[PDB]
Design a protein around this ligand. Structure first.
Ligand SMILES: CCCCCCCCCCCCCC(=O)OC[C@H](COP(=O)(O)OCC(O)COP(=O)(O)OC[C@@H](COC(=O)CCCCCCCCCCCCC)OC(=O)CCCCCCCCCCCCC)OC(=O)CCCCCCCCCCCCC
Ligand SMILES: CCCCCCCCCCCCCC(=O)OC[C@H](COP(=O)(O)OCC(O)COP(=O)(O)OC[C@@H](COC(=O)CCCCCCCCCCCCC)OC(=O)CCCCCCCCCCCCC)OC(=O)CCCCCCCCCCCCC
Ligand code: BCL
Ligand code: BCL
Ligand code: BCL
Ligand SMILES: CC[C@H]1c2cc3[nH]c4c(c3C)C(=O)[C@H](C(=O)OC)c4c3nc(cc4[nH]c(cc(n2)[C@@H]1C)c(C(C)=O)c4C)[C@@H](C)[C@@H]3CCC(=O)OC/C=C(\C)CCC[C@H](C)CCC[C@H](C)CCCC(C)C
Ligand SMILES: CC[C@H]1c2cc3[nH]c4c(c3C)C(=O)[C@H](C(=O)OC)c4c3nc(cc4[nH]c(cc(n2)[C@@H]1C)c(C(C)=O)c4C)[C@@H](C)[C@@H]3CCC(=O)OC/C=C(\C)CCC[C@H](C)CCC[C@H](C)CCCC(C)C
Ligand SMILES: COC(C)(C)C/C=C/C(C)=C/C=C/C(C)=C/C=C/C(C)=C/C=C\C=C(C)\C=C\C=C(C)\C=C\C=C(C)\C=C\CC(C)(C)OC
Ligand code: HEC
Ligand code: HEC
Ligand SMILES: [Fe+3]
Lengths: 38, 69, 335, 271, 60, 298, 101, 56, 55
């Protein structure tokens, strides 16, 4: 681990993590339109 | 493409097929044991006649599913 | 990764099969030559070696097969000779004891005679097997510890004959059947008032759990020092090595006291034997000295108090009185 | 007091927590960090058991009973009068059982031994944890645990067994009983075998490993190894506790009807 | 008599037998590593350590 | 699974009832109760205008019609007067061709049976009596019909066999009790059937540490005993004597009338129909002077 | 007794500062006594068994092939196969002379 | 980031995926066992008809 | 193709036949235990007379 591919991995990990949260946010948006829980 | 140098492709396929096969069987058996989607027995009913779960229900008087205790 | 846990064997050796130590062969001999099982060698020794057969072994096999045949044929006849029903209902089928009103007299063949005959043959087979075990032990100049350990289990087995004879009926015997003998176990506990309050029953429970505890402890201890050679217990007994020392020290530091490589086997022997010995005594006292073990436990301060869950008025006390169970109705009345 | 060969083994090192502070011997016992933790939980739990006896109606040893709370408290910490004391004692027992296992691991590490004894003991702890932790959580109340009394906990076993109208028909209970019975038979055979070789017929020399293998091949046609018998004993004894934990955790959380009715599946096979 | 019954007598006979057996097995447990070493001198618990036991080996 | 537990004994004794949530919810939902008919309690005080009424002789005409519509919907479905009656002449007990209307004789006898249950067996059906619905469920044939099979059939405990105790009331054996283990197995089988007929386990009625004790047992045990007695009065005096009235298709292989058990009323629940109260709104069915202090009109 | 004015409980003529309750053990449990005392408040001893004075042999078709006592509740209550239900009992018999053979 | 010099990316990624899959299955099964969100049976109901817990 | 380089064909064939044989038995047995498709008993019924689930 040369510490340089860690930066390469970090960019992919951050985008994948943030992209997963945005998609899950849309899923909660769709579920709210169907049946709100509050 | 680089993710295959991090995980062995042979191990991922076996894990992938095993998880997908288990998940597909779990979903199919969950629907088969339900009332609305027991398609083997009630698959010929239309959407209007298919069973629906109970809506916001009323109450009952002097009738209890559980014995007193 | 993880160390070698000595749970399985990866490399197995193969040599010529061990024929066996020379013994007297006048009234018996060894059959087979000795084969090797690859699957068995992974867990233990691979040799499915020759087996000794003599007078007692042959007679025991004949009598036991007669008993097994009688039990199986009565089971098969109970379903009307249907093979599909015989396999399908096999756990529920039974060879039932005689009816209660016959006492100790000979029952009819279809109403308990086969049961008594099969029990007699099984008892003869078990005794002949005990003789065979004794002879096998003394042919190799070994001590007779296994014969007496077996005699303890035979004592517990024979209480199932002696208790029905002491109460005076063969109907109280254990039926031959997978689920039916469990049914008998439950009903025997119920009839005599909660066998949990039999003190010798509790003693046998204690010795059964103690046997499990002791075998878990000894197996783990020996496997933990198997890399030092602890599985060769005879050597560590006649010449104490570092494996025996480490076992002793582990248990002394954990518990404050320990055993030796030899005396832990005495502990094991006595726990296993006392299980069936105390159980047999407890069965022998039931129905002959004590008829309700819960009431005996109340007498001797064994029963913990609970708040009353119900109370009955005097008319309720007279009405809730019942009747002891009697004979079944032999007529179908018309009303 | 020490065994004649004990001094050279009493060395430092092998602990999981702590250093030379908790690396001493109190008499024959080894005291580690988990030895100190064991004594704390044992003392607290035993004193609360004595207090529970003093709250009850009798000092009779067989009749003392500390009972779990009512089912209406449902995974909460009940009043100490009403079963909360049982829950506190349960926590002390869990801490003491866990500390005992970790103390055993420290001792084996100091002696250059394997880790088999702590894990074998963990089978018993797992069965206890199923009885008072896992199954009560699945059923939704701490009141599903058994009371702490010599004969009181026998009444619980009887009534729980009869909650399914015939507990003998539990398939996992049937397997667990077979493990217990086979373990007792195998232990008697193993104990006899070693003693018969080491204490043979009077006037004859002590036997060898061949004598054991020849004897059990003559009797049964097969002889498990010297290491095979110890592997089998560990498997039978621990597997008895594991199958016991399974048998009780499926009654209620998974099966609620009578156990005889469970065998419908076998009777309704298409053949 | 009235309070004394057969089950109680058998139980106490078993208790005496068990205690004797435990004494015998504890005697057998002290055949290796004894007597104990202490600064105050030699030590033996109850039961006391038994006599030295010698085995018999086959001739060469 | 989701499990519902009801505590029936002292804490720590292990005396509890367990239910599967899905099955219990489904069973409770699927059970439907017929709504009670609107009351009819105003009629002139004149003589009864009927020809062959021998049981309902103390009931007003409007109440008569009310309960008879109720009987129709309880047994033969809504309307359907033709199950028990000649439509042209309801006062006829025989068909036009001559053969008797067996259904009407059975219904007349079972009006008396229902009155007997409600009046003389309040120690079991206390304030929750029975109507035709509790056994019939809207269908002519109830559940739990049993016939003569063999000598050792435990259901005969409800017809003509008395005595089920097997436990000794002493510490030492005597000749006062010589019950066998086999008789204990018989009692065990009978009690397994009783437990399954109500959806409960042993602990609902017993502290299994001592099956013979009533003080340590829940009160339901007393209720259960009364049930047995009531069955022996319903099977012996009402259901069995109806043998020469049924057609052959209604009898058993020995040619005996159908008989009832606990599951006939309970159908696998601790209370019949989960304890629904219907007979309070049908005065012609209870043979009491007052149900809950509500007077009988007469 | 209670003081008429202050409301204080009086025990042996002395008032008590506090709300007096009667002490009891855990859930009012009382230690058991003699085993005979277990039968106070219980129903009296049951009557003697009804034992038939004679036995008549049933027809074979009314006799069970299986002699297990619990077979009806453990197996038959869950078994509905018609072949097994047929095998449950012995079959009717006659003689060759009765059939004319 | 420097955190990947501290934690192995493979061990973290496997553990994180295993945690998320277990968490997702738990939530889906909790809603399935509930009354308001038993969507396989009552999913066609409108929000007004969906069951609501008691105001008590 | 190159999948047989990554996976042994002989091992794949055995696992595939074993999986297909089990799946076919499970489906055939599930239909046999149903009411609409108990073909050994009710196979001679026409499609209109075959059982249908309630509602
Ligand atoms: C119902 C059916 C059930 C079920 C069936 C029950 C049946 C009876 C079982 C009885 C227990 C057997 C235990 C055992 O290991 O057996 C294997 C052994 C094998 O011996 P072997 O093959 O002949 O030869 C081997 C032998 O060389 C070495 O044996 P080992 O050492 O393994 O064990 C045998 C002895 C120990 O031997 C010695 O101690 C001898 C050493 C040299 C002499 C000692 C110094 C001098 C002493 C002099 C005074 C002493 C002289 C004796 O171990 C035992 O016998 C067991 C001892 C522990 C059990 C008793 C503990 C005390 C109990 C009483 C407590 C009272 C209250 C305080 O077979 C034997 O027969 C051993 C000898 C038994 C002697 C006692 C017999 C008692 C019979 C009682 C009933 C008689 C008719 C009324
Ligand atoms: C079936 C037949 C056979 C049945 C029987 C089977 C027995 C099986 C075991 C066989 C061996 C038994 C003999 C034994 O253990 O001896 C130890 C000791 C000799 O020890 P040593 O060799 O001199 O000690 C070596 C070494 O530790 C030297 O260290 P040092 O001398 O600095 O000791 C420092 C210790 C002791 O200081 C203390 O304050 C500890 C006091 C413990 C006892 C009193 C407890 C109550 C007050 C508590 C303190 C209060 C403030 C000071 O300091 C330590 O910290 C040592 C470790 C202690 C435990 C770990 C820390 C726990 C902390 C949390 C819990 C605290 C307490 C709740 O000798 C004796 O005590 C002589 C008497 C032995 C016979 C037992 C007599 C029992 C009488 C009462 C019976 C009651 C029955 C219900
Ligand atoms: C009553 C409950 C509701 C319901 C409510 C929800 C809600 C709400 C959610 C889910 C979610 C999911 N549901 Mg659900 N769900 C229902 C019924 C079902 C059924 C079924 C048979 O009934 C199934 C099979 C599923 C299955 C699923 C999964 C797809 C998913 C959970 C696992 C996961 O994380 O996957 C992972 C699957 C993915 C597709 C992830 C893809 C991630 C990638 C990395 C995105 C990359 C974006 C891009 C490259 C980068 C942008 C970077 C910057 C932002 C610019 N649901 C019912 C009807 N379900 C969750 C979810 O994640 O939904 C999307 C979720 O939050
Ligand atoms: C409702 C049921 C009752 C009950 C009723 C009984 C009855 C009744 C008995 C026991 C007995 C025992 N019970 Mg209990 N038991 C209950 C609850 C328990 C619980 C528990 C979890 O609560 C436990 C752990 C136990 C445990 C035990 C054992 C300690 C003990 C049997 C020892 C043994 O090794 O037997 C197994 C060993 C043998 C049978 C020895 C003989 C073996 C023979 C030699 C084998 C020959 C085989 C032959 C060659 C091959 C087959 C041939 C074919 C048949 C043809 N019981 C409750 C209270 N229990 C017994 C006992 O001793 O009680 C005092 C006994 O009889
Ligand atoms: C009417 C009653 C029912 C019935 C109902 C039940 C019920 C209910 C259960 C069993 C369970 C068991 N039954 Mg039963 N059982 C019946 C009849 C039998 C019969 C028989 C001969 O008929 C037998 C052989 C058995 C056998 C068994 C075992 C399989 C099992 C008990 C062992 C166990 O769990 O160990 C596991 C070991 C432990 C729990 C011990 C853990 C110990 C801890 C770790 C350490 C303690 C240390 C201590 C505090 C230290 C003290 C101080 C020092 C001494 C100084 N049952 C009848 C039919 N059975 C039980 C079970 O499976 O439990 C899981 C159970 O709950
Ligand atoms: C310390 C008490 C424990 C104990 C001890 C014990 N048992 C022992 C011994 C000892 C010390 C022996 O020396 C002895 C032995 O040899 O063990 C290997 C024995 C033994 N314990 C046995 C069983 C046994 N032990 C049990 C229990 C216990 N044994 C206790 C827990 C139980 C239980 C739990 O119920 C059983 C079933 C035997 C394996 C053996 C005694 C063998 C014996 O007496 O055999 C008599 C011979 C026959 C009955 C002939 C049978 C014929 C076949 C049935 C027909 C074959 C037909 C065809 C060829 C094959 C058909 C296959 C089917 C049958 C599967
Ligand atoms: C493979 C599983 C089997 C087994 C194995 C086993 N047990 C073991 C070991 C092993 C491998 C050990 O190494 C360990 C040991 O060190 O033994 C010397 C032990 C041991 N097995 C023991 C007992 C035991 N094992 C049992 C069960 C079994 N153990 C299984 C059958 C039982 C049963 C069935 O009842 C008992 C009683 C101990 C002697 C010992 C563990 C000692 C220990 O943990 O000590 C620390 C705790 C204390 C000294 C006391 C704590 C007191 C509590 C704080 C309060 C009360 C606790 C409890 C709730 C009371 C309940 C009482 C009522 C139920 C009566
Ligand atoms: C085709 O298949 C055939 C039929 C050929 C073979 C197949 C056979 C099969 C499948 C057999 C199955 C057997 C099974 C399942 C047996 C199950 C046995 C069980 C579970 C037994 C359990 C307990 C039984 C006990 C404890 C019995 C004890 C009996 C005793 C002690 C009896 C003693 C009787 C004596 C001493 C009798 C003496 C006779 C006299 C006249 C002297 O006294 C009355
Ligand atoms: C079988 C359960 C019946 C049903 C479906 C109906 N009735 Fe009906 N009827 C029945 C019984 C047992 C009697 C006699 C009651 C007694 O003897 O006490 C009757 C009688 C009548 C009468 C009076 C007969 C007469 O005039 O002598 C009437 C008017 C009558 N029944 C009417 C009626 C109605 C309106 C029904 C609703 C569909 C009905 N019957 C159904 C038994 C049954
Ligand atoms: C309430 C519906 C009960 C259920 C559930 C169980 N039993 Fe019961 N039991 C009940 C009654 C009313 C009676 C007396 C019946 C009579 O005719 O006298 C009994 C009796 C027993 C007995 C005999 C007690 C004796 O003194 O001999 C036993 C052994 C018994 N019951 C056991 C038992 C079992 C095993 C049960 C579950 C399968 C069970 N009972 C449930 C009431 C009820
Ligand atoms: Fe060993």
């Amino acid at each position: 681990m040369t510490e340089d591919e860690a930066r390469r991995f970090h960019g992919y990990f951050v985008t994948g993590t943030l992209g997963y949260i945005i998609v899950a946010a849309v899923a909660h948006f769709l579920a709210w339109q169907w049946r709100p829980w509050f | 493409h680089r993710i295959w140098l991090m995980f062995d492709p042979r191990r991922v396929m076996v894990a992938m097929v095993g998880f997908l096969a288990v998940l597909a069987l779990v979903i199919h058996f969950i629907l088969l044991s339900s009332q609305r989607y027991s398609w083997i027995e009630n698959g010929t009913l239309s959407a209007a006649q298919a069973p629906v779960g109970a809506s916001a229900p009323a109450a009952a008087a002097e009738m209890s599913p559980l014995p007193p205790g | 990764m993880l160390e070698y846990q000595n749970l399985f064997t990866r490399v197995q050796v193969r040599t010529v099969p061990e024929a066996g130590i020379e013994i007297d062969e006048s009234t018996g001999t060894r059959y087979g030559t000795g084969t090797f099982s690859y699957l068995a060698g992974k867990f233990g020794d691979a040799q499915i070696g020759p087996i000794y057969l003599g007078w007692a072994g042959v007679l025991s096999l004949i009598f036991g097969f007669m008993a097994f045949e009688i039990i199986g044929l009565n089971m098969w006849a109970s379903v009307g000779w249907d093979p599909v029903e015989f396999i399908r209902q096999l756990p529920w089928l039974a060879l039932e004891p005689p009816p209660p009103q016959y006492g100790l007299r000979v029952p009819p063949l279809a109403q308990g005679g086969w049961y008594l005959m099969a029990g007699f043959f099984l008892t003869i087979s078990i005794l002949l097997w005990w003789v065979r075990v004794y002879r096998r032990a003394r042919a190799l100049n070994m001590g007779t510890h296994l014969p007496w350990a077996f005699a303890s289990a035979i004592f517990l087995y024979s209480t199932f004959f002696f208790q029905p004879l002491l109460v005076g009926s063969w109907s109280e015997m254990v039926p031959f059947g997978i689920f039916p003998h469990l049914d008998w176990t439950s009903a025997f506990s119920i009839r005599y008032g909660n066998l949990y309050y039999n003190p010798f029953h509790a003693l046998s429970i204690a010795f059964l759990y103690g046997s499990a505890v002791l075998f878990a402890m000894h197996g783990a201890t020996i496997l933990a020092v198997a890399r030092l050679g602890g599985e060769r217990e005879i050597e560590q007994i006649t010449d104490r090595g570092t494996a025996a020392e480490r076992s002793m020290l582990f248990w002394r530091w954990t518990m404050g006291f320990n055993a030796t490589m030899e005396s832990i086997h005495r502990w094991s022997w006595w726990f296993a034997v006392l299980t069936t010995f105390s159980g047999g005594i407890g069965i022998l006292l039931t129905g002959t000295v004590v008829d309700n073990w819960y009431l005996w436990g109340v007498k001797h301060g064994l029963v913990a108090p609970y708040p009353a869950q119900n109370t009955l008025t005097e008319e309720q006390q007279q009405l809730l009185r019942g009747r002891y169970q009697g004979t079944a109705p032999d007529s179908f009345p018309s009303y | 007091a020490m065994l004649s060969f004990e001094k050279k083994y009493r060395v430092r090192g092998g602990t999981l927590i702590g250093g030379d502070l908790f690396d001493f011997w109190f008499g024959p016992f080894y005291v580690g960090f988990f030895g100190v933790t064991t004594i704390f939980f044992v003392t607290l739990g035993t004193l609360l058991c004595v207090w529970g006896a003093a709250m009850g109606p009798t000092w009779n040893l067989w009749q003392i009973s500390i009972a779990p709370p009512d089912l209406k408290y449902g995974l909460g910490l009940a009043p100490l009068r009403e079963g909360g004391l049982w829950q506190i004692i349960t926590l002390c027992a869990l801490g003491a059982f866990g500390s005992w296992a970790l103390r055993q691991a420290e001792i084996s590490r100091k002696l250059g031994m394997g880790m088999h004894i702590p894990w074998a003991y963990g089978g018993a702890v797992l069965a206890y944890a199923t009885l008072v932790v896992i199954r009560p959580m699945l059923l939704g109340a701490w009141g599903h645990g058994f009371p702490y009394g010599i004969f009181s906990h026998l009444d619980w076993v009887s009534n729980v067994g009869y909650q399914y109208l015939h507990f003998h028909y539990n398939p996992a209970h049937m397997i667990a009983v077979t493990f217990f019975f086979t373990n007792c038979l195998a232990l008697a055979m193993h104990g006899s075998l070693i003693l018969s070789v080491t204490n043979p017929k009077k006037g004859t020399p002590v036997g060898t490993s061949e004598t054991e293998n020849v004897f059990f091949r003559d009797l049964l046609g097969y002889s498990i190894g010297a290491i095979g018998i110890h592997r089998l004993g560990l498997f039978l004894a621990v597997g008895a506790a594991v199958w016991s934990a399974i048998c009780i955790v499926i009654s209620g959380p998974f099966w609620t009807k009578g156990w005889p009715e469970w065998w419908n599946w076998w009777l309704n096979l298409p053949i | 008599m009235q309070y004394i019954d057969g089950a109680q007598i058998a139980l106490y006979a078993f208790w005496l037998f068990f205690f004797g057996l435990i004494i015998y097995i504890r005697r057998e447990d002290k055949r290796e590593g004894y007597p104990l070493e202490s600064p105050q001198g030699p030590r033996e618990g109850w039961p006391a350590m038994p006599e030295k036991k010698t085995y018999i080996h086959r001739p060469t | 699974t989701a499990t519902d537990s009801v505590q029936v004994g002292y804490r720590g004794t292990g005396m509890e009832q367990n239910y599967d949530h899905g099955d219990l919810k489904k069973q409770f939902a699927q059970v439907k109760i017929p709504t009670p008919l609107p009351p009819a309690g105003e009629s002139p005080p004149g003589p009864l205008p009927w020809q062959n009424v021998q049981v309902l002789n103390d009931i007003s005409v409007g109440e008569f019609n009310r309960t008879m519509v109720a009987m129709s919907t309880w047994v033969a479905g809504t309307g359907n007067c033709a199950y028990c009656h000649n439509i042209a002449n309801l006062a006829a007990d025989t068909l036009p061709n001559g053969k008797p209307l067996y259904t009407k004789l059975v219904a007349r006898r079972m009006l008396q049976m229902t009155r007997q249950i409600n009046g003389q067996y309040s120690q079991h059906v206390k304030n929750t009596g029975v109507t035709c619905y509790t056994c019939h469920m809207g269908k002519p044939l109830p559940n739990g019909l049993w016939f003569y099979s063999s000598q050792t059939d435990y259901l005969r405990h409800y017809l003509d066999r008395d005595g089920a105790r097997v436990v000794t009331r002493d510490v030492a054996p005597s000749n006062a009790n010589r019950s066998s283990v086999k008789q204990t197995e018989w009692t065990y089988a009978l009690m397994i059937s009783q437990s399954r007929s109500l959806g409960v386990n042993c602990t609902y009625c017993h502290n299994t540490r001592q099956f013979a004790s009533w003080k340590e047992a829940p009160p339901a045990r007393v209720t259960a005993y009364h049930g047995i007695l009531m069955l022996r009065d319903v099977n012996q005096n009402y259901l069995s004597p109806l043998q020469p009235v049924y057609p052959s298709v209604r009898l058993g292989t020995q040619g005996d009338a159908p008989k009832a058990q606990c599951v006939t009323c309970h159908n696998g629940n601790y209370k019949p129909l989960y304890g629904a109260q219907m007979v309070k709104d049908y005065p012609a069915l209870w043979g009491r002077a007052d149900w809950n202090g509500v007077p009988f009109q007469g | 007794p209670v003081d008429p004015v202050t409301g204080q409980t009086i025990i042996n003529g002395e008032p008590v500062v506090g709300r007096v309750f009667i002490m009891q053990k855990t859930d009012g449990t009382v230690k058991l006594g003699k085993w005979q005392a277990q039968y106070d408040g219980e129903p009296t001893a049951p009557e003697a068994a009804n034992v038939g004075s004679s036995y008549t042999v049933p027809a074979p078709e009314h006799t069970r092939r299986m002699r297990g006592i619990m077979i009806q509740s453990t197996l038959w209550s869950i078994d509905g196969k018609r072949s097994a239900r047929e095998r449950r009992h012995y079959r009717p018999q006659t003689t060759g002379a009765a059939l004319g053979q």
